[PDB]
Amino acid sequence: ASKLELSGPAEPRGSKSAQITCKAKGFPEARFWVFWLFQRAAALDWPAANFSGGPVQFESRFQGNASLKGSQAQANAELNIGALGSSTATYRCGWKLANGGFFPSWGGANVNGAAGAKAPAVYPVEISGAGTGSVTLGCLVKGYNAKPNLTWPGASGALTFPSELNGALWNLASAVTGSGFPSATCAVGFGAATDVDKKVAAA
């Protein structure tokens, strides 16, 4: 079947260049226009399209920022991105039906144009001297540059909020509605060799 396999996540620095690959299978790549799309925070955009045996047609916004090419010897289409800083989004490579202009097959690859790579800091945010029935405990993760994974020891009432950028690092919070409080700990797992687990004390 027609399937398009992309490269993994890329992490350029500020004003570097990132090349995104789209291997094509199941169809003659030279016969179809392979497109590219730009989804930053749930808003699909259209960088450009490339006919693997000839022309490349860009959007007026991406003139000179995107550069599409096709290595027709292989079944590979590439998008090279120029200067960066706000191009952190998810990039797709659809191909249009050879008659309509709509996109039957899609991919998905995410770029992250930031700087730095640090270890997260765990702060056990706790109660302020109050209690009635169930109580809300918490765990703050601040200052990392990857995708973390916050967990609790077998308790499923947790809410881990999406991480947000503050400066150049990511911040995240986790909240648990625990009824009884004999002992509770927040265990974070980070890709860059960080596995700190901190207990939450009273007051």
Binding site: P104, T136, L159, F161, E164, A175
Partner: protein, 201 residues
């Protein structure tokens, strides 16, 4: 380019019917495609030429002559609660609009304020965290350090699979030197009545 406008970014429906509308800035001659995208997955073609399915479940139908198009889900299930996009294939520069579904529930917000930990206070920082774990709708969070503050960072999850309610986390980061303004209050304004103010001193 032709501007494609999906008016409602969020629509509520449980098990009956959804009518997602797409409005085109120009007469597109019934040429509108529809994409279904679950989070973390690429958009999937549903209906091209504004009426024609592509190996899709029969519940998804579409309608529209020109400049006004609809996609109807007559049997909306748990998978159908995803993000739906409409595309024009009339003009050279293709354009998309963006819309999403969610189930319906009641209401009722909850709030809790948490002061900075001793460990954070040691390392030159102070984050006051306001949690709003369970509510339905849209909400606004105000910080009062005896005065309104505009340095707070906010984050919102999606919708809980079981509770069908949203959450919110508001973080107020203040340095140790500026950590003497009095008492810190977090005020919530949901579709209820009165400010859900939780405070610490």
């Amino acid at each position: 380019a032709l501007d494609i406008n999906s008016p409602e970014a969020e629509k509520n429906a449980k098990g009956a019917r959804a009518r997602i509308t797409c409005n085109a800035g120009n007469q597109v001659g019934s040429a509108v495609a529809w994409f279904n995208q679950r989070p973390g997955d690429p958009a999937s073609l549903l209906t091209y030429w504004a009426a024609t399915e592509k190996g899709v479940a029969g519940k998804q139908s579409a309608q529209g002559a020109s400049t006004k198009f609809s996609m109807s889900s007559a049997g909306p299930e748990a998978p159908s609660l995803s993000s739906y996009w409409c595309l024009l294939f009339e003009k050279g520069a293709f354009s998309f609009g963006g819309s999403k579904l969610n189930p319906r529930e009641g209401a009722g917000p909850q709030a809790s304020i948490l002061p900075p930990s001793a460990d954070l206070n040691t390392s030159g920082g102070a984050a006051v965290v306001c949690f709003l774990p369970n509510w339905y709708g849209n909400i606004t969070v105000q910080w009062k350090t005896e005065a309104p503050q505009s340095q707070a960072n906010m984050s919102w999850p999606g919708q809980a699979g079981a509770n069908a309610a949203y959450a919110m986390a508001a973080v107020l980061a203040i340095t140790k030197g500026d950590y003497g303004p009095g008492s810190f209050t977090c005020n919530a304004s949901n579709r209820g009545t009165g400010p859900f103010a939780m405070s610490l001193n």
